[model samples]
Target: AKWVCKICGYIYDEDAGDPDNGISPGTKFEELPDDWVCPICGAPKSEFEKLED
Candidate 1:
């Protein structure tokens, strides 16, 4: 699954997680930490929208 940041349009790919943000590859959106924010725009997880798998 892929999640997009509504604030900046940054796409978070589950298969290629944001390593720089501390999220490893293959990490799911549901598995993301509560403290995790968009690496691009700093938006919270609630600010992200889900895309079809």
Candidate 2:
């Protein structure tokens, strides 16, 4: 699944997890810790919406 940041329109793909942020590939959105925030806009996980696809 993919997630999008509502604040900055940043796209986070599970298949291509954010390695720079210390998240490895194949990491699900639900697996993300609450402390995780949008690397682009600094939006919290609560501000992210799951992609329907």
Highest TM-score scorer: 2
Candidate 1, residues 1-53, lDDT tens digits: the string is 89898789988989898888798999999799999888877888989998866
In candidate 1 the C-alpha lDDT for residue 42 amounts to 83
lDDT (0 to 1) per candidate: 0.88, 0.88
Stretches of candidate 2 off by over 4 Å are none
How far does residue 42 in candidate 2 sit from its true spot (Å)?
A: 0.9
lDDT of 2 by residue, 1-53 (tens): 89899888998999899898889999988798779998988888889997896
The alpha-carbon deviation from the true structure for residue 11 of candidate 2, after best TM-score superposition, in angstroms, is 0.7
Compared with the true structure, the alpha-carbon lDDT of candidate 1 equals 0.88
Cα RMSD (Å) per model? Answer: 1.0, 1.1
User: Which residue window of length 10 is worst by lDDT in model 1?
Assistant: 37-46
TM-score of 1: 0.87
- Clash count per candidate: 0, 0
